[PDB]
Structure 1
Amino acid sequence: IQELILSEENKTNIAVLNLGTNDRRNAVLILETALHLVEKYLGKIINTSYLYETVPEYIVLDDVNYINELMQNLEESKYEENKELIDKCEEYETFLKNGKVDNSILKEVNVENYLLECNNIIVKNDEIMKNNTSYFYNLTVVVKTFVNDPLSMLVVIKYIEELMKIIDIDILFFNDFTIFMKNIKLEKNMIYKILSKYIHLEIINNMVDNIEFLSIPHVYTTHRYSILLCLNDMIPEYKHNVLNNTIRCLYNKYVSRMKEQYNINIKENNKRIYVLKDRISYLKEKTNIVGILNVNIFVEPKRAVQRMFEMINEGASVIDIGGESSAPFVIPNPKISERDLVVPVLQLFQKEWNDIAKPIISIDTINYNVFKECVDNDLVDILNDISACTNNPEIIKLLKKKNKFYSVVLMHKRGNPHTMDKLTNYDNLVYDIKNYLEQRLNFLVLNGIPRYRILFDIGLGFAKKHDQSIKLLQNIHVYDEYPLFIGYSRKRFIAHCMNDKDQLLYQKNICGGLAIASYSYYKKVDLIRVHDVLETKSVLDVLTKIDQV
C-alpha cells in the first residue's frame, strides 16, 4: 500500500471535479471557498465552468460565517503554490486528445463491467429515491493534480468537506481511467497516512464510512443534465472510453431529447450565472448600469465622491472609476499620476460610505501598481482592463487572493489613443473580436480565474471605424452565451448616425446613447457603461415595466 498509494515519486494527473451547494445566498462564498481549498490541497485549477442554478436530479429514469473563521485556521499543504502565469499545459493537452498517460495504480475495469456496475448503482438509487425542494448551485473545475490517484483524491476531498462542515465534491474523471471499486474498507490510520502525504496536520472518524465505493467516471456523469451543462463549458470535445460521444454531443442530445419527447425546453430553469462581486447574477436577466467616474482639469476627491453618491441615487449598480483617459487623441496631465487621481477618491468614498445598497466598484486601469494598491486596501471589486490583461498579464495574479476572487472586464482594442483610428483592418470583424475575447478568457481560465467572473467587452470606438462599431452592435447576438459589458456612451460613432451649435450635438449624442440603451435592453446586454445614469435609468425602468405582464 505504501509502495503505491503513498509512493515517493510525484505525478502530474488531470482531474475533473464537480461542485455543489444548496445555499443560494452564500453560493459564491461556499463554492469559491471550495475552489481555494482545491487550489490549496489538490493542485492547480486550469479550467472552470460557469456557475449554474440547477433543478434537482434525484431520479434518473423519470447561513453563517464560520467559513471565514476556517480560512484563518488551515493546515499548510505539503505542496507549493505557484502563481506564475502559464501559456499551455502539456498534461491537459494529453487529457483532451485522450493520449498516453501513466498506468493507473488503482485496478481498472473494462467498458462492459463499468456499464453493468454503473447501471446497477442507478436502478438501486432510483427506487430508493422513488420511495422517499431547493435549487442546486453547480460548478465544475479541471485541476492539474499532484495527488497520486482518484481514491487518495477522494480522501482529501472528504477532508475539505468536513473542514467546511452545504458542499458536495465529486470526481468526474481522473486521466483516462475506468474504475469501479465496490467495497472500500479504509483504515482509520490509512486515511491519516494519505492526508499526511499532502497536508501538514495539526474529523477522520467521520470519513471512514463515508467512502464505500469509487466510480471513475462518476456514476451520474451522463445522467445529470447539470453535470453535462458544466462540462460543456470546459471540455466540449472530450471523449472518455466509457462515453458514447463527446461531451458536446451528449449535452446536445440531452437538450433535444427533453424537447422532442417531453416538450420541456431544459435551459429555462437551469440558469447560467455570472458574478460581479459576491452575489449571483442570472445571465441575460438584467441590464445593469455602470456609472462612469472620469477623474481628469483636475477633479477634487470631495467633488468626485459627491458625484459617486449622486450616481448611486440616480440608479447606478456599478461605478467604473478611471484616472487614465482612453478617449481618442488625448494625452494625460503629466503633473499628477493615475494613482494620485484615483486612489484618494476611492479612499474617501470608503470613509464616506462607512459612516452611513453598496455599489460595486470597478477600476478602469491597465496598471499593476494602481490595482495592487486598490485591492490591498479593499477599495475595488472589479478590474476593467481595456487591454484584456495583455499589457501586463501579471495583473491576473491580483485577481486571486486566497479566499477572495475578483471579477474582470476584458476589452478588445488595438494600439493606443493616437494609433487606434488607423488600426482598422479586420478579415472578419465580428468573429475576430469574438475569437480574441474567447482566447483571452481561455488564458485567464487556464490561470485559475473562474469563468463566471469574466466579462466580455467588444471595445466600441477602439480601432473601429464608425460603421464597424455599428456592425458590432448589429451582431451583438454573438455574445448570447457570455456576460457582456459595453461602453457606447458619448462616442463619436453615435454622432455619425445622426442628421447654440456646440451644446446641440452634445445633446443629440446623449439622446442617441439612450437608443443604444433601449437596444441593449432588448438584446439583454448584462452591463452598460454610461455617463448619463439618470437618463439611462429612466429608459430602462419604463422598458422593464412594459415587459411586466
Structure 2
Amino acid sequence: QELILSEENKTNIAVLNLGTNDRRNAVLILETALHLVEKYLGKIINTSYLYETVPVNYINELMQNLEESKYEENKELIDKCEEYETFLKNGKVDNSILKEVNVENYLLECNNIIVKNDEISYFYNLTVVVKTFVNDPLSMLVVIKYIEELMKRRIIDIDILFFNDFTIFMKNIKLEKNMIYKILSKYIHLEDPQEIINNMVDNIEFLSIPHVYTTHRYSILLCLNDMIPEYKHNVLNNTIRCLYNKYVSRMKEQYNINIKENNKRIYVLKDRISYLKEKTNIVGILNVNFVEPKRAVQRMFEMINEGASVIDIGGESSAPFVIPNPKISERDLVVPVLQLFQKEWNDIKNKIVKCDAKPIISIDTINYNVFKECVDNDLVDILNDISACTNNPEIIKLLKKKNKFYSVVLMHKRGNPHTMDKLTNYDNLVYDIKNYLEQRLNFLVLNGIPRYRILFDIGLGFAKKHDQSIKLLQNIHVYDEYPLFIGYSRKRFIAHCMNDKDQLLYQKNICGGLAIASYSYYKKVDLIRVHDVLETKSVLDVLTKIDQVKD
C-alpha cells in the first residue's frame, strides 16, 4: 500500500503530451505547464515543436504562490544523459513497482477503450521527455493532476505517453484522499492548498502505459517524431518514425488527405504563435558602434513604422577585420539604448492601442554579462548568438527563468573577424553547416530549451567565400523543416554578384539585397535581418499582393 513510497532514489524517463484548446493563450499555457513539469517532476531533456492540429491573469498570480518542490533544481549544463540513452536503446532498467501486463492483454484492453469512445476546436500540442525523480507512473499521474488543478484556479491536458519500457493497464484505480496527499507530499512541500485534493479522487480512473491514443492520434506521432524518431516500445509494431510515415501515406491512400495541411508546425519568437514557413518577417538592424541613445531610439521607432517585426541590436561589430575601440564597452553601447527604448515605449504605450504593436527585441551578443543585464531588466526577447552559444554556453542558462523562456538564434561561423576569411574548407559545405546547427540545437534541447524557440542561421559571410555564401542560398531548401533566420544585408558576397563611386556601390548593394529578399520570400525564409527596412517591406508587400488571389 505504501511500498509506492519506498526510500530508494531513482531516475526514470517519462514522455509527456501537453495539450490545450486556447489558441490565444496556447504558448503561455503550454510553457506554464513546462515550468511546472520542470519544477515538480524532474528535468526536461527534450521537446517537440509546437503544433496546431485538427482531430489569463491568474497564471501570473499562480507562479507567485507555488509550493516549493522537495526536490532539487540543477541548472548546470549537461552533455549526455545516461538514463535517456538507456531509455532510447531499450537497455536494462529496474522492474516496474506497478504490475505490468503482456502485449496481448495491453492490445486487447486498448482496443476496448478505443471502441467504447467510438460510440460518443483547434488543438495545440507539444511533447516532453523528462528525466524524472518520481518513482512510478501512477505517482506521476497524481502530481500531473495536481498541476492541472493548479492551472484551473479544458485549459491543459497532460498525458503520460511512456515511462521507461513499462507496459501497464490498471482498470479500476481508486486512491484514498489521504494517499494522494501522501504521494504529493513526497515530492512537494505541501502547506487553498487542501481543497484541490478533493477534485482529484474521481479523476484517476485507470492507468495505461503507453497511453491509449499514442499510435492512434496523428498529433502525438507528429510530436514524438521530432524527439525520438528511432524509439521502439515493446508494445509497438515499429519505430516512432516508421509509425509516423505510415500514418501520413495511409491518409493519402485511404482518403485523399495531406495531413500536414491541417497540422501546422509552430515556432515562437516571444510570446505568440508563428506558423512555420507562412510569413517572412523583417528584422531591422540597429548597429550601435558613437551612436547616441536618443538617436538610436529614434531609429528604432523609424524601423517599427517602416515595418520591422523585430529589432536586432548589437554593440560589437563582427565585420571582417574590425578592431573595436576599447574606449567604450559593449554593455555601455547597448544597455542605455535598450533602457531608453523601454522608457519611450512605455510613455506612448498607454496613450494608444499598442501592445501587439511592440517589436520583438533581439540582441546580437556572445557575451554573458551583456545578456544577463538585458534579461534581468526585461529589455530583450531574443538572444542572437553568432557563435551558436559555443563561446560561452553558460549563456544558455540565461534563456530560462521561473516563468519565462527566451528564444535564440544559432548562427554558424568559424574563427573570429580576423581569421574567419581563412577558415573556408568544408568537405560538404551545405550539410556540414546543417549538421552543425542540428548538433547545437540538440545541445540546447538536451538542456531544456524548447525546440520551437530555436532558430537556424547559416551565417552568410562568416568563414564562407562568396561562392560558398551563394551556394548556401541556392540550397536553402534543406532548412524547410526549421525556423530559418538569415542575414545577407550589405555583405560582401552581394557585390561579388554584379558585372563591370562608393555611393553607387552602396546602392547596388541595397538593391542586390532586395533580390535576396525576393528569393527569401519565395523560399519562405522565416526571418531576414536587414538594414533597409522600408525598401524590404515594399518588396515583400508587392510580392504578397501578387500571390493573393482575389474573390
Q: How does the TM-score come out when normalised to structure 2?
A: 0.96
State the SS of the aligned residue for 2:80. Answer: coil
**1:42 paired residue number:** 41
**Counterpart-to-counterpart distance in 2, 1:123 and 1:260:** 23
**1:59 paired residue number:** none
State the SS of the aligned residue for 1:210. Answer: coil
Shift of 1:228: 0.2
- 1:307 correspondence with 2:299: yes
Shift of 1:500: 15
**Counterpart-to-counterpart distance in 1, 2:503 and 2:522:** 30
Deviation string 1:455-477 (CA, Å, 9 cap, x unpaired) is 00000000001000000000000
Deviation string 1:172-195 (CA, Å, 9 cap, x unpaired) is 000000000000011100000000
**1:15 paired residue number:** 14
Deviation string 1:383-442 (CA, Å, 9 cap, x unpaired) is 000000000000000000011100000000000000000000000000000000000000
State the SS of the aligned residue for 1:5. Answer: coil
State the SS of the aligned residue for 1:340. Answer: helix
Shift of 1:234: 0.1
**1:139 paired residue number:** 126
**Counterpart-to-counterpart distance in 1, 2:431 and 2:332:** 38
1:516-527 paired onto structure 2 within 5 Å: 516-527=516-527
**Counterpart-to-counterpart distance in 2, 1:515 and 1:414:** 27
Deviation string 1:115-140 (CA, Å, 9 cap, x unpaired) is 00011000001112xxxxx1000000
**Counterpart-to-counterpart distance in 1, 2:471 and 2:2:** 63
**Counterpart-to-counterpart distance in 2, 1:31 and 1:221:** 19
State the SS of the aligned residue for 1:164. Answer: helix
**Counterpart-to-counterpart distance in 2, 1:53 and 1:382:** 23
**Counterpart-to-counterpart distance in 2, 1:498 and 1:264:** 45
Shift of 1:4: 2.5
1:49-88 paired onto structure 2 within 5 Å: 49-56=48-55, 64-88=56-80
Shift of 1:338: 0.2
Shift of 1:333: 1.2
Deviation string 1:301-357 (CA, Å, 9 cap, x unpaired) is 0000000000000000000000000111101111000000000000000001001x0
Deviation string 1:44-71 (CA, Å, 9 cap, x unpaired) is 0000000000102xxxxxxx21000100
**Counterpart-to-counterpart distance in 2, 1:28 and 1:332:** 40
**Counterpart-to-counterpart distance in 1, 2:547 and 2:92:** 55
State the SS of the aligned residue for 1:371. Answer: helix
1:229-240 paired onto structure 2 within 5 Å: 229-240=222-233
Deviation string 1:25-46 (CA, Å, 9 cap, x unpaired) is 1111000000000000000000
State the SS of the aligned residue for 2:119. Answer: helix
State the SS of the aligned residue for 1:209. Answer: coil
**Counterpart-to-counterpart distance in 1, 2:237 and 2:106:** 13
Shift of 1:375: 0.5
**Counterpart-to-counterpart distance in 2, 1:386 and 1:101:** 41
| Structure 2 unaligned residues grouped into runs of 5+ | 348-356
**Counterpart-to-counterpart distance in 1, 2:78 and 2:381:** 25
Structure 1 residues 117 and 500: alpha-carbon distance in aligned structure 2, compared to 1, 3 A threshold: closer
State the SS of the aligned residue for 1:397. Answer: helix
Segments of 4+ moved more than 6 angstroms: none
| Structure 1 unaligned residues grouped into runs of 5+ | 57-63, 129-133
**1:157 paired residue number:** 144
**Counterpart-to-counterpart distance in 2, 1:328 and 1:250:** 48
Q: 2:88 aligns with which of 78, 83, 96?
A: 96
Deviation string 1:347-373 (CA, Å, 9 cap, x unpaired) is 000001001x00000000000000000
Shift of 1:506: 1.0
**Counterpart-to-counterpart distance in 1, 2:437 and 2:421:** 20
Shift of 1:105: 0.2
**Counterpart-to-counterpart distance in 1, 2:93 and 2:479:** 36
1:374-385 paired onto structure 2 within 5 Å: 374-385=374-385
**Counterpart-to-counterpart distance in 2, 1:205 and 1:377:** 41
Shift of 1:269: 1.1
State the SS of the aligned residue for 1:186. Answer: coil
Deviation string 1:72-121 (CA, Å, 9 cap, x unpaired) is 00000000100000000000000000111110000000000000001100
Q: 2:247 aligns with which of 244, 249, 254?
A: 254
Shift of 1:502: 1.5
**Counterpart-to-counterpart distance in 2, 1:466 and 1:540:** 25
State the SS of the aligned residue for 2:339. Answer: helix
**Counterpart-to-counterpart distance in 2, 1:100 and 1:114:** 21
Say how many residue pairs are matched.
534
**Counterpart-to-counterpart distance in 2, 1:370 and 1:470:** 33
**Counterpart-to-counterpart distance in 2, 1:412 and 1:191:** 50
Shift of 1:235: 0.2
**1:331 paired residue number:** 323
Structure 1 residues 205 and 326: alpha-carbon distance in aligned structure 2, compared to 1, 3 A threshold: same
**Counterpart-to-counterpart distance in 1, 2:534 and 2:3:** 66
**2:483 paired residue number:** 483
Deviation string 1:196-230 (CA, Å, 9 cap, x unpaired) is 00000091111001000000000000000000000
State the SS of the aligned residue for 1:228. Answer: helix
Shift of 1:3: 4.9
State the SS of the aligned residue for 1:509. Answer: helix
Shift of 1:530: 0.2
**Counterpart-to-counterpart distance in 1, 2:170 and 2:145:** 17
Deviation string 1:464-523 (CA, Å, 9 cap, x unpaired) is 010000000000000000000000000000000101912111110110000000000000
**Counterpart-to-counterpart distance in 2, 1:240 and 1:401:** 34
- RMSD (Å) for aligned C-alpha atoms: 1.0
**Counterpart-to-counterpart distance in 2, 1:462 and 1:414:** 7
